[PDB]
Amino acid sequence: REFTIDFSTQQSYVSSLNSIRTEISTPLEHISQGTTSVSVINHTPPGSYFAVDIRGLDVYQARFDHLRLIIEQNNLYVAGFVNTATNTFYRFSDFTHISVPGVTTVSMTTDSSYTTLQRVAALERSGMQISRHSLVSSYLALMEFSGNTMTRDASRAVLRFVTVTAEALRFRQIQREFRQALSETAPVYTMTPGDVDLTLNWGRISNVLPEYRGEDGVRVGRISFNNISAILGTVAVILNCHQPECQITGDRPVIKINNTLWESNTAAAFLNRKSQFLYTTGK
Amino acid sequence: ADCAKGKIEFSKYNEDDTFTVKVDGKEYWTSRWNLQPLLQSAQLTGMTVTIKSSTCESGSGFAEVQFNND
Amino acid sequence: ADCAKGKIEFSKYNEDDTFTVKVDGKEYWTSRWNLQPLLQSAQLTGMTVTIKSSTCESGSGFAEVQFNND
Amino acid sequence: ADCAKGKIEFSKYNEDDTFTVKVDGKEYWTSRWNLQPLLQSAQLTGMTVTIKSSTCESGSGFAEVQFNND
Amino acid sequence: ADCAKGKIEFSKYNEDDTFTVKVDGKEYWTSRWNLQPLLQSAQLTGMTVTIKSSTCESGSGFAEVQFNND
Amino acid sequence: ADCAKGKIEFSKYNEDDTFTVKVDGKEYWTSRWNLQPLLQSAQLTGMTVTIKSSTCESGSGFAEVQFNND
Numbered sequence: 294r295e296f297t298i299d300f301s302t303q304q305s306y307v308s309s310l311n312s313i314r315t316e317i318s319t320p321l322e323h324i325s326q327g328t329t330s331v332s333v334i335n336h337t338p339p340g341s342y343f344a345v346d347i348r349g350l351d352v353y354q355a356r357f358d359h360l361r362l363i364i365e366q367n368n369l370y371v372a373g374f375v376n377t378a379t380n381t382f383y384r385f386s387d388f389t390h391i392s393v394p395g396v397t398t399v400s401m402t403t404d405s406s407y408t409t410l411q412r413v414a415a416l417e418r419s420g421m422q423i424s425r426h427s428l429v430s431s432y433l434a435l436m437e438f439s440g441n442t443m444t445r446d447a448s449r450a451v452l453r454f455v456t457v458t459a460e461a462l463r464f465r466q467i468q469r470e471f472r473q474a475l476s477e478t479a480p481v482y483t484m485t486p487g488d489v490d491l492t493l494n495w496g497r498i499s500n501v502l503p504e505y506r507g508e509d510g511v512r513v514g515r516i517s518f519n520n521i522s523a524i525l526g527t528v529a530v531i532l533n534c535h536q537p538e539c540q541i542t543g544d545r546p547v548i549k550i551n552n553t554l555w556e557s558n559t560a561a562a563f564l565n566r567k568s569q570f571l572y573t574t575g576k
Numbered sequence: 577a578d579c580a581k582g583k584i585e586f587s588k589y590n591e592d593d594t595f596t597v598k599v600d601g602k603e604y605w606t607s608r609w610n611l612q613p614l615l616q617s618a619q620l621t622g623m624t625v626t627i628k629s630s631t632c633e634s635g636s637g638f639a640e641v642q643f644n645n646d
Numbered sequence: 647a648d649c650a651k652g653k654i655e656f657s658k659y660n661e662d663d664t665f666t667v668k669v670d671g672k673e674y675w676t677s678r679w680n681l682q683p684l685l686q687s688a689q690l691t692g693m694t695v696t697i698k699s700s701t702c703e704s705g706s707g708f709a710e711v712q713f714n715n716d
Numbered sequence: 717a718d719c720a721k722g723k724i725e726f727s728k729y730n731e732d733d734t735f736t737v738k739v740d741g742k743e744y745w746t747s748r749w750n751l752q753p754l755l756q757s758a759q760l761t762g763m764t765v766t767i768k769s770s771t772c773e774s775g776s777g778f779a780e781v782q783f784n785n786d
Numbered sequence: 787a788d789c790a791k792g793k794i795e796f797s798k799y800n801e802d803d804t805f806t807v808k809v810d811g812k813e814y815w816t817s818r819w820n821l822q823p824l825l826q827s828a829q830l831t832g833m834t835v836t837i838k839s840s841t842c843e844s845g846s847g848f849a850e851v852q853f854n855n856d
Numbered sequence: 857a858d859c860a861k862g863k864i865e866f867s868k869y870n871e872d873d874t875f876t877v878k879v880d881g882k883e884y885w886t887s888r889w890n891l892q893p894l895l896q897s898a899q900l901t902g903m904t905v906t907i908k909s910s911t912c913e914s915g916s917g918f919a920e921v922q923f924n925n926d
């Protein structure tokens with residue numbers, strides 16, 4: 294399966310993401326309004342991927358059109374990128390189970406993690422800027438990339454593209470914030486600590502939202518949603534809770550406390566303290 | 577004896593550093609400090625607690641309590 | 647007496663190792679260390695706390711507090 | 717020996733300040749104070765624990781326990 | 787004075803018995819063990835903490851911190 | 857030395873009261889009492905912890921650990 298994410302305008306970009314979501318996921322019964330929902334990725338065999346053709350980096354022009362991202366469908370991870378001009382698929386080391394037919398696959402030594410990417414890129418995601426201009430730069434860097442080991446510039450490009458494709462697919466918050474960079478004023482999107490926190494809690498959020506039944510709020514670690522519009526405005530797609538995982542430990546997705554749905558692990562993590570006086574004095 | 581079994585209706589830290597919980601309509605207090613976080617946690621997560629004590633007078637002390645998620 | 651009843655608006659650990667909570671617009675502090683994490687758990691979870699004391703002036707101390715869920 | 721591995725079925729604070737957990741249908745008690753909140757948190761979240769002790773019959777004591785992510 | 791305000795970016799216990807937290811891009815440390823669970827709970831629940839000291843600067847010890855859910 | 861940076865695969869309370877965590881396939885123990893609830897909270901929430909110590913062989917002890925949100 295292949296989809297295009299067209300960066301020409303906010304409309305084309307959002308339309309692109311919505312079309313992907315519609316095809317690969319199913320709205321949660323309890324968090325859906327109109328056709329805007331938190332959707333659960335439909336189950337697919339492991340190894341399944343869909344391709345994303347990057348378009349519109351230069352608004353509405355069939356230029357800079359040789360970049361394709363290979364996305365593992367069950368977790369929305371960018372497994373690597375394809376230079377369609379050289380018919381080469383640069384695949385991260387942790388995605389050797391993703392095979393793409395018809396392209397030359399270059400198995401990389403670099404893995405897909407943000408810890409690795411940020412190191413190699415010498416770029417932290419918190420505060421990372423992404424603009425139409427840097428996506429063009431990112432594109433050029435990936436088209437110029439060669440080799441089995443990510444370079445700083447290719448890593449910066451992957452960080453930027455993963456954010457505006459996979460992370461935006463997962464989080465409507467990032468789709469909303471980033472899309473402003475596509476407008477004619479060409480402002481800069483700056484990834485916030487909150488954006489970063491969301492991405493780091495995707496699996497946890499995924500395990501909790503299917504349990505939502507209209508509670509006043511949802512608390513997942515550092516993440517808080519006070520009402521359904523907050524949920525919808527923040528999250529678009531979650532893992533199928535039937536690399537990111539739905540379970541960290543234990544087997545209880547949630548605990549409802551004072552009409553707030555809490556990730557049980559979060560509550561367990563501040564309810565596991567012994568008596569303060571005994572704690573502090575028992576050095 | 578099982579003095580009371582049910583959800584904790586309210587808990588309360590007392591001026592004498594004891595801790596009170598109301599379960600199934602009756603209040604019991606304990607002087608065991610580590611029961612404070614244990615009981616608050618049970619109250620917050622909805623655990624059924626079974627207060628046990630040789631004597632079960634209302635407003636009586638206890639130092640044995642079973643915790644069940646259900 | 648019930649000084650204040652409501653959700654903890656903010657809590658604050660103080661340099662003298664006392665701990666302050668703001669409930670229903672008034673600040674109260676306790677020197678009971680055990681209450682620090684219990685109040686934090688209550689604040690995190692939106693418990694309704696009732697500050698009790700023989701002195702209810704905002705900025706006053708307390709060592710008795712009830713914790714209620716909704 | 718690894719005596720029981722599974723979720724905590726119930727826990728109980730005992731009069732002698734030891735703390736009991738029922739795992740894999742067997743009851744085990746520990747006098748390690750620190751284990752109380754840790755076992756209760758494991759319990760509320762359904763964390764699998766492995767009780768280790770010299771004897772594995774229900775009623776045995778333990779001072780070692782592993783908290784698993786199963 | 788308010789030194790830093792924000793969620794806790796990371797916390798760290800050092801061999802020298804100091805506990806560092808990074809808030810709003812600055813590191814502060816405290817050796818008050820009472821603050822460890824409070825700060826870590828704030829960190830894992832995303833509370834906004836306000837580090838406070840008579841004098842604010844990077845790397846100074848602190849023993850006053852306010853906790854807010856948001 | 858930079859021993860491990862990863863999630864806690866399991867934690868264990870040991871008979872000698874030290875506490876072990878397995879991170880990046882290696883086991884590290886700490887006798888630092890303050891760290892027990894903190895390490896379990898890290899395990900419960902999947903925090904990435906960074907353990908540093910003079911030696912990094914599995915079975916080494918540590919006192920320094922950073923709790924990351926990423």
Ligand SMILES: Nc1ncnc2[nH]cnc12
Nearest residue numbers: 370371405406407455459
């Ligand atoms: N390569 C990647 N693709 C999507 N989400 C990611 N999160 C971290 N690395 C990622």
Ligand code: NA
Nearest residue numbers: 308309311312
């Ligand atoms: Na569309």
Ligand code: NA
Nearest residue numbers: 315316318319
């Ligand atoms: Na669909």
Ligand code: NA
Nearest residue numbers: 545546557558
């Ligand atoms: Na859970």
Ligand code: NA
Nearest residue numbers: 629631636637
């Ligand atoms: Na009694």
Ligand code: NA
Nearest residue numbers: 699701706707
């Ligand atoms: Na008072």
